[PDB]
Design a protein around this motif. Structure first.
Motif, PDB file in Angstrom:
ATOM      1  N   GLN A   1       0.811  -1.227   0.000  1.00  0.00           N
ATOM      2  CA  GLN A   1       0.000   0.000   0.000  1.00  0.00           C
ATOM      3  C   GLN A   1       0.842   1.274   0.000  1.00  0.00           C
ATOM      4  O   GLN A   1       1.706   1.477   0.851  1.00  0.00           O
ATOM      5  CB  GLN A   1      -0.976   0.036   1.191  1.00  0.00           C
ATOM      6  N   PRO A   2       0.585   2.158  -0.968  1.00  0.00           N
ATOM      7  CA  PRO A   2       1.319   3.422  -1.089  1.00  0.00           C
ATOM      8  C   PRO A   2       0.697   4.591  -0.334  1.00  0.00           C
ATOM      9  O   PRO A   2      -0.515   4.664  -0.180  1.00  0.00           O
ATOM     10  CB  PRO A   2       1.309   3.655  -2.592  1.00  0.00           C
TER      11      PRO A   2
ATOM     12  N   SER B   1      -2.441  10.995   1.856  1.00  0.00           N
ATOM     13  CA  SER B   1      -3.390   9.903   1.967  1.00  0.00           C
ATOM     14  C   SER B   1      -3.973   9.878   3.374  1.00  0.00           C
ATOM     15  O   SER B   1      -3.267  10.111   4.356  1.00  0.00           O
ATOM     16  CB  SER B   1      -2.703   8.575   1.674  1.00  0.00           C
TER      17      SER B   1
ATOM     18  N   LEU C   1      -8.361  -1.318   1.229  1.00  0.00           N
ATOM     19  CA  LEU C   1      -7.139  -1.007   1.973  1.00  0.00           C
ATOM     20  C   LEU C   1      -6.654   0.412   1.658  1.00  0.00           C
ATOM     21  O   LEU C   1      -6.751   0.877   0.521  1.00  0.00           O
ATOM     22  CB  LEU C   1      -6.017  -1.989   1.593  1.00  0.00           C
ATOM     23  N   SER C   2      -6.115   1.089   2.665  1.00  0.00           N
ATOM     24  CA  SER C   2      -5.582   2.437   2.482  1.00  0.00           C
ATOM     25  C   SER C   2      -4.461   2.662   3.492  1.00  0.00           C
ATOM     26  O   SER C   2      -4.553   2.207   4.643  1.00  0.00           O
ATOM     27  CB  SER C   2      -6.688   3.486   2.666  1.00  0.00           C
ATOM     28  N   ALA C   3      -3.403   3.350   3.059  1.00  0.00           N
ATOM     29  CA  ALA C   3      -2.260   3.630   3.924  1.00  0.00           C
ATOM     30  C   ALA C   3      -2.421   4.980   4.625  1.00  0.00           C
ATOM     31  O   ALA C   3      -2.213   6.036   4.016  1.00  0.00           O
ATOM     32  CB  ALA C   3      -0.965   3.615   3.103  1.00  0.00           C
ATOM     33  N   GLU C   4      -2.790   4.937   5.903  1.00  0.00           N
ATOM     34  CA  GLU C   4      -2.993   6.148   6.698  1.00  0.00           C
ATOM     35  C   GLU C   4      -1.644   6.832   6.966  1.00  0.00           C
ATOM     36  O   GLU C   4      -1.574   8.042   7.126  1.00  0.00           O
ATOM     37  CB  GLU C   4      -3.697   5.787   8.012  1.00  0.00           C
TER      38      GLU C   4
ATOM     39  N   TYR D   1      -5.462   0.787   6.977  1.00  0.00           N
ATOM     40  CA  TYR D   1      -6.804   0.566   7.490  1.00  0.00           C
ATOM     41  C   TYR D   1      -7.294  -0.515   6.525  1.00  0.00           C
ATOM     42  O   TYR D   1      -6.856  -0.567   5.371  1.00  0.00           O
ATOM     43  CB  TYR D   1      -7.714   1.795   7.312  1.00  0.00           C
TER      44      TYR D   1
ATOM     45  N   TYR E   1     -14.302  -1.161   9.983  1.00  0.00           N
ATOM     46  CA  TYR E   1     -12.846  -1.227   9.911  1.00  0.00           C
ATOM     47  C   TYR E   1     -12.315  -2.402  10.713  1.00  0.00           C
ATOM     48  O   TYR E   1     -12.624  -2.530  11.897  1.00  0.00           O
ATOM     49  CB  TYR E   1     -12.218   0.055  10.461  1.00  0.00           C
TER      50      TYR E   1
ATOM     51  N   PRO F   1     -13.372   4.381  12.739  1.00  0.00           N
ATOM     52  CA  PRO F   1     -11.919   4.189  12.723  1.00  0.00           C
ATOM     53  C   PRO F   1     -11.232   4.645  14.003  1.00  0.00           C
ATOM     54  O   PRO F   1     -11.331   5.808  14.384  1.00  0.00           O
ATOM     55  CB  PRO F   1     -11.488   5.004  11.513  1.00  0.00           C
TER      56      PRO F   1
END
Lengths: 209, 135
Positions: free
Chosen positions: A135-136, A165, B43-46, B52, B61, B76
């Motif tokens: 994940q970027p 992000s 999916l995501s990069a916090e 997450y 979540y 979250p």
């Protein structure tokens, strides 16, 4: 004398087998019977031939197994073991999925963000496109002056993170600037990082009076 | 084809062959049922290397509590962040950030039931995950 039968079904409960490319996959179907049954494999319901894949495949009749080395996406499919003897035949099918992936820092599409211009009070946008397995994380940054200088003690440039992000940010790969001012002019950077490393590319904003 | 990372995905567990799934009742398990509507994850990069994991169906979540139980929080919080890493054989692994020092991984048992964080160890198949597309 007896028709074939499974000796170890526990190892056959796992239906779908998904694996990263370049790994070795092994399928098994422990069986019994009298006389001892023979074993053959099908790929998608058809006879599995040595020429059906680079390097072909291997088998161990001692383990009732099929072995495929350094698997690749094209190996994706159904694999059926066929156990036979004069008295009968039984089979079992496994599904194989192969995904290619490795730890590499982000790679950006050349050319983006692209330079831009507009008159004072106008709008503009900067775009960034990323290729990344892990994940970027995307940050949009502007090169700024802090306490009278564009560069700090380490010679590196002063940066201001404008956006990054996050669940509280929308459309991470695009930075939209609205009702611009001659102060927004400058260099904008798209910095993308994953735990392996980072990448960045920049563009300029020119403001016409 | 840029931007594949931002498409929903199924997190496949090599241990038993299940797909990670979030149940409306908050509990989380694994099912070989690829039609199951609660396995499509976003999916995501916090932060760098910190993610997450969110159900595209319910919006919950993925999370791990003070014990190691996987629950699907409606909002979250700090228990929803995991450290996503690729391991030596190229599978993904997810370690609770909140309990990172204890190596508490996200994991499923052969019997589809989560394998509580305190019970997860490096060399286990239970922690090995593979992100797959929606098909």
């Amino acid at each position: 004398k007896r028709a074939p039968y499974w000796t170890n079904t526990e190892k056959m409960e796992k239906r779908l087998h998904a694996v990263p490319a370049f790994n070795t996959v092994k399928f098994r179907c422990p069986a019994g019977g009298n006389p001892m049954p023979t074993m053959r494999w099908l790929k998608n319901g058809k006879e599995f031939k040595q020429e059906h894949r680079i390097g072909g495949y291997k088998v161990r009749n001692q383990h009732w197994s099929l072995i495929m080395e350094s698997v690749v996406p094209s190996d994706k499919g159904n694999y059926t073991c066929v156990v036979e003897n004069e008295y009968g035949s039984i089979n079992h099918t496994y599904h194989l999925d192969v995904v290619e992936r490795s730890p590499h820092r982000p790679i950006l599409q050349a050319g983006l963000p692209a330079n831009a211009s507009t008159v004072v009070g106008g709008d503009v946008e900067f775009v960034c496109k990323v290729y990344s397995d892990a994940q970027p994380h995307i940050q949009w940054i502007k090169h700024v002056e802090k306490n009278g200088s564009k560069y700090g003690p380490d010679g590196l440039p002063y940066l201001k993170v404008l956006k990054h992000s996050g669940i509280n940010s929308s459309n991470a790969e695009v930075l939209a600037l609205f009702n611009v001012t001659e102060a927004d002019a400058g260099e904008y950077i798209c910095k993308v990082s994953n735990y392996i490393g980072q990448a960045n590319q920049s563009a300029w904003l020119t403001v016409l009076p | 084809p840029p931007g594949n990372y931002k498409k929903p995905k199924l997190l496949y567990c090599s241990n038993g062959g299940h797909f990670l799934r979030i149940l409306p009742d908050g509990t989380v398990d694994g099912t070989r049922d690829r039609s199951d509507q609660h396995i499509q994850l976003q999916l995501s990069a916090e932060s760098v290397g910190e993610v997450y994991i969110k159900s595209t169906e319910t919006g919950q979540y993925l999370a791990m509590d003070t014990d190691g139980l996987l629950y699907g929080s409606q909002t979250p919080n700090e228990e929803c962040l995991f450290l996503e890493r690729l391991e030596e054989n190229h599978y993904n692994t997810y370690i609770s950030k909140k309990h990172a020092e204890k190596n508490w991984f996200v994991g499923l048992k052969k019997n589809g039931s989560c394998k509580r964080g305190p019970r997860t160890h490096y060399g286990q198949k239970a922690i090995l995950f593979l992100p797959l597309p929606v098909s």
